[PDB]
Write a protein that binds this ligand. Structure first.
Ligand SMILES: [Mn+2]
Length: 248
């Protein structure tokens, strides 16, 4: 019952029923003119001040949440790429907030990087607040995908011709490398944005995942999480499960 565990539980419980959007930021494998662009082909560390700061935040979140009782054999390249993506995902969120003139302190958000059985790396984002409404979900997805595709093409470490960069940009947008949770439907039928409950989804779902400690990653595991209150960031796996238990 450390203050950190109690503090996270209390913070989430207060936001138990806050409606938020659910996004997934991802990438897919691409081959352009014989050039392979895989999930971890975006390893440029761009020297923009905010991005550098965000990447440092991810590194330190990883460092503080690491359990040293057990050894961790995650590949260095994998960690690097995840830290970079954490900075890029956040940069996208912050750019859209700026477009809407939303004060960052008026926003609740949660970010969690995972490795899926079939898709591999992806990043969940829950985001909402008083300045957000369900009808804005589709606009948010589109804007986030614009910024996400733009930053990915900038961060790509594969030498690309201008035509190739533009093609990659178009692929990331056309194939919706940012997804928005909607109610189940038909291809022809309309899709409705499905808002989720912030604290509940975090405590009863995201905090239940198993920590990735190996390469290749365990199917369905998580790498790293963070939130707008810096509450879950530094928690070890065992502490996260304690939060879920207390939250109930
Ligand atoms: Mn997932």
């Amino acid at each position: 019952y450390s203050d950190e565990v109690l503090g996270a539980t209390n913070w989430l419980k207060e936001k138990s029923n806050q409606e938020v959007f659910s996004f997934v930021f991802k990438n897919e494998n691409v081959q352009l003119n014989g050039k392979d662009i895989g999930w971890n082909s975006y390893k440029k560390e761009l020297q923009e001040d905010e991005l550098k700061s965000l990447q440092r935040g991810a590194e330190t979140t990883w460092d503080q949440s690491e359990d040293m009782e057990w050894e961790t054999t995650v590949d260095e390249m994998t960690k690097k790429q995840v830290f970079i993506f954490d900075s890029l995902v956040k940069k996208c969120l912050f750019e859209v907030l700026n477009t809407k003139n939303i004060f960052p302190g008026d926003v609740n958000w949660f970010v969690q990087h995972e490795w899926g059985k079939d898709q591999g790396w992806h990043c969940h984002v829950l985001i909402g607040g008083k300045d957000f409404s369900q009808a804005q979900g589709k606009w948010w997805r589109r804007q986030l995908n614009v910024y996400w595709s733009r930053w990915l093409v900038t961060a790509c470490n594969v030498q690309l011709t201008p035509a190739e960069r533009i093609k990659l940009r178009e692929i990331a947008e056309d194939n919706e490398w940012v997804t928005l949770l909607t109610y189940k439907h038909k291809q022809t039928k309309k899709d409705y944005t499905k808002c989720v409950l912030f604290g509940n989804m975090i405590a009863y779902y995201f905090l239940t995942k198993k920590k990735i400690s190996t390469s290749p990653p365990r199917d369905g595991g998580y790498f790293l999480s963070s939130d707008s209150g810096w509450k879950t960031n530094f928690l070890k796996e065992g502490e996260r499960h304690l939060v879920s238990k207390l939250y109930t």
